[PDB]
């Protein structure tokens, strides 16, 4: 329920 | 993990931290002033704990031995001019999946886009990382022509 989201493109 | 600076820039290439050290990594990273980390290779870990600690993680990959798009260079170039003028003394970490991989290539661009010839940047880098820029990469940098909109 966390994983690596963030970033943009 | 190695580091290279030039003018207002200070980067820090690193090794894809395993989940087994993420806690220590963060501690290392924060001891350098690293506020951002660009992952240009496969992502093998969560970012919540990191982002928890004011450290954004941008994910802009591209196949090693392959020119990093056109977008990726923009952002990189912008990111670099911004973050540095915006956070005086801060570091920016770039890391790959295996080891160095293609990470140097960026930093190089950062140096090239800063008034350094590609060789001047290749040397400046191989000073910290014994062997980097496999034959192919050396070509990319060589062909690469800068936009050159970096004020100092």
**CATH fold for domain B1-152:** 3.90.190
Ramachandran assignment for B112, one of left (phi > 0), alpha (psi -120 to 50 degrees), beta (any other): alpha
Q: Which regions of B15-151 does DSSP assign to beta strands (E)?
A: 34-39, 56-59, 91-95
Ranges of each domain in chain B: 1-152
Strands, DSSP E only, in chain B?
A: 4-6, 9-14, 34-39, 56-59, 91-95
In sequence order, which residues have a C-beta less than 8 Å from that of residue B48 and are 6 or more positions away? A2, A3, A5
- The residue of B57, B73, B76 whose CB has the most chain A CBs within 10 angstroms, and thus the best one to mutate to test that interface, is B57
- Round to whole Å and give the CA distance between B151 and B71: 20
Looking at the complex, report in whole angstroms how far the Cα of residue B31 sits from the nearest Cα belonging to chain A: 22
Q: Cβ–Cβ contacts within 10 Å for residue B63, how many?
A: 10
Note whether B108 and B118 are within 8 A (CB).
yes
Q: Which of B45, B56, B71 is opposite residue A6, by nearest beta carbon?
A: B56
Encode B12-56 in three state secondary structure.
Answer: EEECCCCCCCHHHHHHHHHCCCEEEEEECCCCCCCCHHHHHCCCE
Residue B64 annotated to the active site: yes
Beta strands in B15-118 (DSSP E): 34-39, 56-59, 91-95
CB B13 within 8 A of CB B1: yes
Counted residue by residue, chain A has a size of 9
- Please name the residue of chain A whose CA is at the shortest distance from the CA of residue B59: A7
Which tokens belong to B28? 């290392």
- CA-to-CA distance for B3 and B125, rounded, in angstroms? 9
* C-alpha distance from B70 to closest chain A C-alpha (Å): 12
Kindly state the tokens that stand for A7.
């970033």
Cα(B7)–Cα(B30) distance, rounded to whole angstroms? 21
The answer for A 1-9 residues in CB contact with B (under 8 A) is 2-9
Q: Taking a C-beta distance cutoff of 8 angstroms, is the pair B112, B118 a contact?
A: yes
* 3-state SS class at B85: helix
- Which structural technique was applied? X-ray
Q: Are B68 and B76 in contact (CB under 8 A)?
A: yes
């Amino acid at each position: 329920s966390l994983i690596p989201p963030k970033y943009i493109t | 993990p190695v580091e290279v600076t030039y003018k207002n820039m200070r980067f820090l290439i690193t090794h894809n931290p395993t989940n087994a050290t993420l806690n220590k990594f963060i501690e290392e990273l924060k001891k350098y002033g690293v506020t951002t980390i660009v992952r240009v290779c496969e992502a093998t870990y969560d970012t919540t704990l990191v982002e928890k600690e004011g450290i954004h993680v941008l994910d802009w990959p591209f196949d090693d031995g392959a020119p990093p798009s056109n977008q990726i260079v923009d952002d990189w170039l912008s990111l670099v001019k911004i973050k540095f003028r915006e956070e005086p003394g801060c570091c920016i970490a770039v890391h790959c999946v295996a080891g160095l991989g293609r990470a140097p290539v960026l930093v190089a661009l950062a140096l090239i886009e800063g008034g350094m010839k590609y060789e001047d940047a290749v040397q400046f880098i191989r000073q910290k990382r014994r062997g980097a820029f496999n034959s192919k990469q050396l070509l990319y940098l060589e062909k690469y022509r800068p936009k050159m909109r970096l004020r100092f």
